[PDB]
A paper describes a structure:
The 70 kDa heat shock proteins (HSP70s) are an abundant family of ATP-dependent molecular chaperones, involved in many cellular processes including protein folding, prevention of protein aggregation, modulation of protein complexes, and protein transport between cellular compartments. HSP70s bind to extended hydrophobic sequences in newly synthesised and partially folded proteins, in a manner dependent on a cycle of ATP hydrolysis and ADP/ATP exchange. HSP70s consist of a conserved N-terminal nucleotide binding domain (NBD) with ATPase activity, a substrate binding domain (SBD), and a poorly conserved C-terminal domain which terminates with an EEVD tetratricopeptide repeat interaction motif123. The two main cytosolic HSP70s are the ubiquitously expressed HSC70 (HSPA8), and the stress-induced HSP72 (HSPA1A)3.
The difference in affinity between 3 and 2, between adenine and adenosine, and between 8-aminoadenine and 8-aminoadenosine illustrates the importance of the ribose group in nucleotide binding. In addition, we found an intriguing difference between the HSC70-NBD conformations of the adenine/adenosine, 8-aminoadenine/8-aminoadenosine and triciribine fragment/triciribine structural pairs. In the three structures with the ligands without the ribose, the phosphate-binding loop 2, which protrudes from the IIA NBD-subdomain and is one of two phosphate-binding loops characteristic for the actin ATPase family, adopts a distorted β-hairpin conformation similar to that in the nucleotide-free HSC70-NBD/BAG1 structure. In this conformation, the peptide groups between Gly201 and Gly202 and between Gly202 and Gly203 are flipped relative to the nucleotide-bound conformation of phosphate-binding loop 2. By contrast, and to our surprise, in all HSC70-NBD/BAG1 structures bound to carbocycle-containing ligands and small fragments, phosphate-binding loop 2 adopts the distorted conformation also present in the nucleotide-free HSC70-NBD/BAG1.
Author numbering:
A (entry chain A): 1 to 381
B (entry chain B): 150 to 261
Write the structure that this text describes.
């Protein structure tokens, strides 16, 4: 295989994305399964090691030896408030090894412990491979992004994750900086630009304020919710259809994991449809106790069910405008990152707050970070 | 009153029917093995080890089946598509009878 170009990688909490700059445009690479984003999952079995889609797929079969959320552990000490808070919701073990956390799995019949960067490296190798498969070229050089709030330890460990993976990590840049680079807000007219990045995706909510002074991005403030994402909107849709099935038939399906699974799955699909259509229909034969569940949900209802959650995304926007010492009217550009920003109510609430100002949503939100990191990789090439 | 549009939804359900058959074959082998261990001449001490060795396969079969149901659950069939709705209901009921046999395998292995 011939030598390839440099790539941009967005190493996310739930999904990672890889892009390459070619023919004067960024191409986001689809994996072996044809997916443009790959799960941040590594599963250990009796016979093999599964990464990405194949790890995500077997989770239900093997929940204890399927690792995800390593990014939440990366660069953190075991005694970190965030580490002890999160391990209570993981089906995998996290152990204290000299103050450093380590996941504890059962791999090929043996008890194996891995540092968070070793997990994150296996994921990175997958990203590297995805690109190597598409281009038919050996990929070594890469630009990996990290959140703006990531400290020195969290940053170095991510670069350590890139190293173990066998990537010549050209640079580590911020996720808000990469999303801004993707829209070329650094190439714009005027002297100082105040950028607000609204990132609702990857099971996290990050509100960043940036200032582009002569092409130098400065992070003025950071706000948000580390446990607010798509899943919360789904939980509300799930509770709605459980209650509805209760008023319809006087039967509780919550105890049945399979009926809840089927309903939650259609609820994820019905939500996506509600971002481009004002109504979504659901037909589930023999859902619970032999009953067929044929129902529908409007965009107006989905909005009502998440009304407090949706409106609440602006508290961080107000909190970030405070800490950056800027009025809303001083914001030159708004950037939409993450899949949940596709929600028309989120776009409208954020547009009305900025007094009808246009939002930057043209670049797929899920790909905006990787798109920016790939532009950066080409520049450093 | 048969529509060409229905033929499209019938082809989807036929392909899903053949996918069920493939997973049903895997279930069939597990059941023959299970029946074989339970009724077989294996040393009693060993029998438990032989039973638990079906865990990974049974759990895979159940997941494959759950995935089949989620592919079926994406179908929107109008009233007039009477044959597709009967074919749809039939397959779900068959995958459910298959899943309830899987639960039986699970109830007979790795017990303590
Ligand atoms: N189309 C979409 N609408 C709403 N939430 C989403 N999350 C990812 N894609 C989405």
């Amino acid at each position: 295989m011939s030598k390839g170009p440099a790539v941009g990688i967005d190493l996310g909490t739930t999904y990672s994305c890889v892009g390459v700059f070619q023919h004067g445009k960024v191409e986001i690479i689809a994996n072996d399964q044809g997916n443009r984003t790959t799960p941040s999952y590594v599963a250990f079995t009796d016979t093999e090691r599964l990464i990405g889609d194949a790890a995500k797929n077997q989770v239900a079969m093997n929940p204890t030896n399927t690792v995800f959320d390593a990014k939440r552990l990366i660069g953190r000490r075991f005694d970190d408030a965030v580490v002890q808070s999160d391990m209570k919701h993981w089906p995998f073990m996290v152990v204290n090894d000299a103050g450093r956390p380590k996941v504890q799995v059962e791999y090929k019949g043996e008890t194996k412990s891995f540092y968070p960067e070793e997990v994150s490296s296996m994921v990175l190798t997958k990203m590297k491979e995805i690109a190597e498969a598409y281009l038919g070229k050996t990929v070594t050089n890469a630009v990996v992004t990290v959140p703006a709030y990531f400290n020195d330890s969290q940053r170095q460990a991510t670069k350590d994750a890139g190293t173990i993976a066998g990537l010549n990590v050209l640079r580590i840049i911020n996720e808000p900086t990469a999303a801004a680079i993707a829209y070329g807000l650094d190439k714009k007219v005027g002297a100082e630009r105040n950028v607000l990045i609204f990132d609702l995706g990857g099971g996290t909510f990050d509100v960043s304020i940036l200032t582009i002074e002569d092409g130098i991005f400065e992070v003025k403030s950071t706000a948000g919710d580390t446990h607010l994402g798509g899943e919360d909107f789904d939980n509300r849709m799930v509770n709605h259809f459980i209650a509805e099935f209760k008023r319809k038939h006087k039967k509780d399906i919550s105890e049945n994991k399979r009926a809840v699974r089927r309903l939650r799955t259609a609820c994820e699909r019905a939500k996506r449809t509600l971002s481009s259509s004002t109504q979504a229909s659901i037909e589930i034969d023999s859902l619970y106790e032999g009953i067929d569940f044929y129902t529908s949900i409007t965009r107006a209802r989905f909005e009502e069910l998440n009304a407090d959650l949706f409106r609440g995304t602006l508290d961080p926007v107000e909190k970030a405008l405070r800490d950056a010492k800027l009025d809303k009217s001083q914001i030159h550009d708004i950037v939409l990152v993450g899949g949940s920003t596709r929600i028309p109510k989120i776009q409208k609430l954020l547009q009305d707050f900025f007094n009808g100002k246009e939002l930057n949503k043209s670049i797929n939100p899920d790909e905006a970070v990787a798109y920016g990191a790939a532009v950066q990789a080409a520049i450093l090439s | 009153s048969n529509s060409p549009q229905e033929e499209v939804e019938l082809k989807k359900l036929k392909h899903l029917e053949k996918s069920v058959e493939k997973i049903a074959d895997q279930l069939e082998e597990l059941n023959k093995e299970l029946t074989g261990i339970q009724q077989g001449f294996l040393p009693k001490d060993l029998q438990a080890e032989a039973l638990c060795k079906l865990d990974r396969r049974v759990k895979a079969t159940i997941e494959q089946f759950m995935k089949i149901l989620e592919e079926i659950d994406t179908l929107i069939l109008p009233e007039n598509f009477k044959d597709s709705r009967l074919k749809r209901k039939g397959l779900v009921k068959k995958v459910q009878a298959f899943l309830a046999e899987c639960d039986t395998v699970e109830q007979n292995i790795c017990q303590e």
